Amino acid sequence: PPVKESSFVEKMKKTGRNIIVFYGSQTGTAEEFANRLSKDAHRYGMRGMSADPEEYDLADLSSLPEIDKSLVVFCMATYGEGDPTDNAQDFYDWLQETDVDLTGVKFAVFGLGNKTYEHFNAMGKYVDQRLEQLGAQRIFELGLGDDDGNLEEDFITWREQFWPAVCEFFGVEASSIRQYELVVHEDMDVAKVYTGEMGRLKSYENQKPPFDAKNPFLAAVTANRKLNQGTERHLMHLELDISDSKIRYESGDHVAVYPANDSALVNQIGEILGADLDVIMSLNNLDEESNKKHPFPCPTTYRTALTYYLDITNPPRTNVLYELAQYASEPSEQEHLHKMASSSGEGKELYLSWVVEARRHILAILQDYPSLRPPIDHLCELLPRLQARYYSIASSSKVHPNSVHICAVAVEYEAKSGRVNKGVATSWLRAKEPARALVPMFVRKSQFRLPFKSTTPVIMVGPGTGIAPFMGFIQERAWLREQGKEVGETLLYYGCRRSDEDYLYREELARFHKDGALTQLNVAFSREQAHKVYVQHLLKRDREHLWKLIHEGGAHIYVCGDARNMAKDVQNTFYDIVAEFGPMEHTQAVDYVKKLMTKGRYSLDVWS
Ligand SMILES: Cc1cc2nc3c(=O)[nH]c(=O)nc-3n(C[C@H](O)[C@H](O)[C@H](O)COP(=O)(O)OP(=O)(O)OC[C@H]3O[C@@H](n4cnc5c(N)ncnc54)[C@H](O)[C@@H]3O)c2cc1C
Ligand SMILES: Cc1cc2nc3c(=O)[nH]c(=O)nc-3n(C[C@H](O)[C@H](O)[C@H](O)COP(=O)(O)O)c2cc1C
Ligand SMILES: Nc1ncnc2c1ncn2[C@@H]1O[C@H](CO)[C@@H](O)[C@H]1OP(=O)(O)O
């Protein structure tokens, strides 16, 4: 646990704030929403601040009533399996244990979730319920943002009704403002300029453990090979050297990496704006009291900022386009940008089709609305931060303690915007050549793990890149057998298009099967025949034996890969197996499978 800042209420008093917005964020979405709401306060005769709950003791909520017409808002995303984001875990544990009386506290919650997940918006729902139980009063309805539809629009809709409700309750009423000031640095020592590191200046050059999110370890890429035969896609296997990093990991964990944006994209942004990207500068918070001195590590050059610190590839959110509208000299273009933030009508329709569906990134917008010429410093203040990307470690630390393996598909597709979009992290990783290519990384512990007992049967289901954590699982189960331990059945249900085209790790898997590390190697080749053959079809085929393992053997089920359709289709097949052999009705079978999840016998590692 980090050292907590002093009372946030006392800070609000000293700064004249009456609204504080906390963010439970893993990948920065909730963080940006909280900042937007904090800034909105100003437009309604109020003053707010955004804050990371992990840096404070939320028990001070009981003192919030000491400030007249005060309000606290929580923008909380859910993560893992219906769990709090890492930065909100402390707050979550407090909520569960405390008995503090929050009479007088006024609150509102906007939850960020995804309906395709088992526990939709669990964190937002919990915080909203809990604050009321503790005696606080809800000032506005709980917002349920759904990233499976369009989260940005859900926030827009909620926000548009939130402020009027707040104004009406507190009896308050409704130009561009900058949060940072530009300071150019002439003749500055190169030793004080950030060049891409995340935390402490020169932390990338002078590596000192422990290594984590704020201090990533630069791991040498010792291997990077194409796993598939065709040319339609690029599937790759990479091996990262973590020797001497003191980093520990287990099969099932994830490795996070900090990539660099495409240099050509960065160059073009500077070029179209007519800005010198090599100018060394700092963007300093006009609020000298704030803990957030800069939008990203400063001093640094715009080129470095656009390359390592800012997201320049995802579709800009509406507030960014709204603030940029002032720099568009063509009326129709200024209007289009202005209306992107609309909660209905053609403005909303245009945002959804022209920006989101077409996947237009910032450069694309600057190109298609050529009158839009914002100053580079303001643009850097508006763009969100570049996030680390997570990969399921494809190796076992029992076999490869000094190496972390990655199995990924390179992202590259034709967007409706007319250009070819490239995945930031995958394009960057793909270009890493062994012999010294370094990847800034860190390990995040997951709850995806092999059984504690070697004798417990394992059922692994992971088609495509979903096979990633299982290569580690199999390496380990094979190692255990080699160590003379008694290992239960180890079944793999894998899937790809064709055996001679994209059968990932075919050679390695054949080996494990031949040696007995893999009890069964069930592979569904989806395109070797007219009808689709998927992993769930093989599960249904083996329903009798799978039931025996689940019902009598206490087997652990693992599902990895596509969370859009495969995960649910597989889950549905398990519902059918349980229903037939229980026997029991569908409803009961569903409850049965969900109970397996709660007992740690049905684990997921699904994304996108
Ligand atoms: C816990 C976890 C584990 C993961 N494990 C792995 C893993 O082991 N292997 C792996 O390959 N990935 C895995 N990922 C995904 C990985 O983290 C990245 O999201 C992925 O590699 C893409 O990153 P990128 O930076 O290359 O692409 P980005 O620049 O982040 O672009 C990604 C976005 O591109 C858009 N997009 C992609 N294709 C299209 C399309 N055809 N049409 C329109 N839009 C599209 C989508 O919005 C997608 O979100 C995992 C993710 C999580 C969260
Ligand atoms: C590994 C992972 C697990 C997730 N688990 C859940 C979940 O259990 N429930 C839910 O509603 N959303 C879940 N989501 C979706 C996020 O809550 C949603 O994308 C949110 O917008 C992320 O906000 P952030 O960028 O502020 O963390 C998950 C996303 C990832 C990547
Ligand atoms: N909904 C689904 N359930 C299980 N596998 C799926 C799936 N959708 C696609 N797949 C298969 O997952 C593997 C990796 O993408 C491919 O064989 C793909 O087959 P397809 O692409 O031929 O449909």
201 three-state secondary structure: coil
Structural method: X-ray
Cα(254) to ligand 1 centroid in Å equals 14
Q: How far is CA 214 from the centre of its chain?
A: 16
Q: Angle at which helices 29-40 and 151-170 pack, to 10 degrees?
A: 30
Mutate to test the pocket of ligand 3, among 228, 467, 532 (most ligand atoms within 8 A of CB): 532
CATH topology of domain 449-606: Rossmann fold (3.40.50)
Q: What are phi and psi of 380, to 5 degrees?
A: -65, -30
- Tokens 């009158």 -> residue: 371
Q: Which helix (H) or strand (E) holds 145?
A: strand 143-146
In CATH terms, are 3-174 and 449-606 the same topology?
yes
Ligand nearest to the backbone CA of 154: 2
Residue type, 238: L
DSSP string, 388-425: PEEEE--S-TTT-TTEEEEEEE--EEE-TTSSEEE-HH
Question: Residue 166: left (phi > 0), alpha (psi -120 to 50), or beta?
Answer: alpha
- Ligand 2-lining residues (CB < 6 angstroms): 25-31, 77-82, 85, 112-114, 117, 119-122, 147, 151, 607
In terms of Cα–Cα distance, which of 168, 201, 369 is closest to 298?
A: 201
Q: How far is CA 266 from CA 26, 195, 262, 310, 363, in A?
A: 25, 15, 6, 10, 9
Ligand nearest to the backbone CA of 259: 1
Ligand nearest to the backbone CA of 528: 3
- Cα 187 from Cα 321, distance rounded (Å): 34
Say what the resolution is, in angstroms.
Answer: 1.9
Residues after which the chain is broken (C–N above 2.5 A) are 174, 435
| 163 carries an active-site annotation | no
Do 248 and 379 contact (CB within 8 A), yes or no?
Answer: no
Mutate to test the pocket of ligand 3, among 499, 500, 526 (most ligand atoms within 8 A of CB): 526
Those residues whose C-beta lies under 8 Å from the C-beta of residue 494, and which sit 6 or more positions away, are 462, 463, 467, 470, 504, 509, 521, 522, 523, 524, 535
Do 2 and 54 contact (CB within 8 A), yes or no?
Answer: yes
In terms of Cα–Cα distance, which of 452, 398, 472 is closest to 248?
A: 398
Q: How far is CA 313 from CA 147, 385, 422, 506, in A?
A: 18, 11, 8, 34
Q: Which helix (H) or strand (E) holds 165?
A: helix 151-170
| 94 carries an active-site annotation | no
Q: Does domain 3-174 have CATH number 3.40.50.360?
A: yes
**Closest protein CA for atom 7 of ligand 3:** 566
Structure tokens at 184: 């150019």
Strand partners, 215: 212
Q: How far is CA 99 from CA 103, 137, 238, 372, in A?
A: 12, 16, 49, 53
266 three-state secondary structure: helix
Distance spanning both ends of the chain, measured CA to CA:
30
446 three-state secondary structure: coil
Q: How far is CA 451 from CA 391, 488, 600, in A?
A: 21, 10, 9
90 three-state secondary structure: helix
- Cα 194 from Cα 135, distance rounded (Å): 47
Q: Given 392, 397, 403, 417, which residue is catalytic? A: 392
Q: How far is CA 233 from the centre of its chain?
A: 24
Domain assignments of the chain as residue spans, ordered by start? 3-174, 206-259+386-448, 260-385, 449-606
Those residues whose C-beta lies under 8 Å from the C-beta of residue 438, and which sit 6 or more positions away, are 218, 219, 220, 221
Q: What is the DSSP letter of 354?
A: I
DSSP string, 514-550: HHTS-SEEEEEETTSSSS---HHHHHHHTHHHHHIII
375 three-state secondary structure: coil
Do 422 and 401 contact (CB within 8 A), yes or no?
Answer: no
Cα(416) to ligand 3 centroid in Å equals 24
Q: What are phi and psi of 394, to 5 degrees?
A: -100, 25
Judge if the beta carbon of residue 426 lies within 6 A of ligand 1: yes
Q: What is the DSSP letter of 309?
A: I
**Closest protein CA for atom 16 of ligand 2:** 113
Pick the atom of ligand 2 nearest to 115's CA.
11
Structure tokens at 22: 């906390």
Structure tokens at 378: 């303001």
- Cα 329 from Cα 370, distance rounded (Å): 9
| 560 carries an active-site annotation | yes
Q: Does domain 260-385 have CATH number 1.20.990.10?
A: yes
Q: Which CATH number fits domain 206-259+386-448: 2.60.40.10, 2.40.30.10, 3.10.105.10, 3.40.630.30?
A: 2.40.30.10
